[PDB]
């Protein structure tokens, strides 16, 4: 039974380890980080600054969210400044 349990545990570990992202696993931080092929031409901007894989066709494909996050990002970052500067008395 114990052996079986051990085996099960091992398989679970294997499952988990396979699933984990590579950069996190080596990690320790935060033309490829792991030497993977990288794109050439200028890509659209991104939240995390990740660079598209060498194999990207070069068409925008997006629901349009990633740009709307910046609008909220800029907003929230702006109203921290507007709140004090528009203060009056």
């Amino acid at each position: 039974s114990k052996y079986e349990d051990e085996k099960a545990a091992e398989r679970e570990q294997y499952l988990k380890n396979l699933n984990m992202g590579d950069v996190q696993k080596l990690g320790i931080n935060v033309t490829s980080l792991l030497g993977r092929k990288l794109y050439d031409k200028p890509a659209p901007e991104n939240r995390f600054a990740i660079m598209p894989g060498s194999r990207w066709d070069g068409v925008h494909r997006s629901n349009g969210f990633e740009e709307k996050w910046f609008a909220k990002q800029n907003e929230i970052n702006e109203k921290k400044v507007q709140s004090y500067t528009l203060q009056e008395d």
Binding site: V23, R36, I50, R61, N63, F65, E66
Partner: protein, 128 residues
């Protein structure tokens, strides 16, 4: 359109950054379930749209054992996880071939019967 519905609510509240985001539930996951694909899109073409958000290490397309044609779903692991947060969120609800595909985070368990299909895929993605 299920997931796309969430992020609009979420963003509206200014949730901003993963600690408060539901994407934080995962962190150990990389593969993404890619649903409602068209039938004729193959592994290479699913490996077109999804490098916009990162660098894929693996891919699996689900296809019938006999006739060998698309079931219509795939499992694609990005090298750096946070691509997953990026792909699920940004590209979900997007049209290809008339039908709007679905993405979501997934825990992916390999199946014996495809074992060779892994090296056969890997060797191409192992080129880079």
């Amino acid at each position: 359109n299920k997931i796309q519905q969430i992020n609009d609510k979420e963003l509206q509240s200014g949730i901003l950054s993963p600690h408060q985001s539901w994407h934080n539930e995962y962190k150990d996951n990389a593969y993404i379930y890619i649903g409602n694909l068209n039938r004729e899109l193959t592994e290479g073409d699913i490996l077109t749209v999804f490098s916009e958000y990162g660098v894929p290490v693996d891919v699996i397309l689900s296809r019938d054992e006999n006739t060998g044609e698309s079931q219509g779903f795939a499992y694609l692991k990005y090298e750096d996880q946070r691509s997953t947060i990026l792909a699920v969120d940004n590209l979900n609800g997007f049209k290809i071939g008339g039908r709007a595909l679905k993405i979501d985070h997934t825990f992916y368990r390999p199946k014996r019967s495809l074992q060779k299909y892994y090296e056969a895929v890997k060797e191409e993605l192992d080129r880079d």
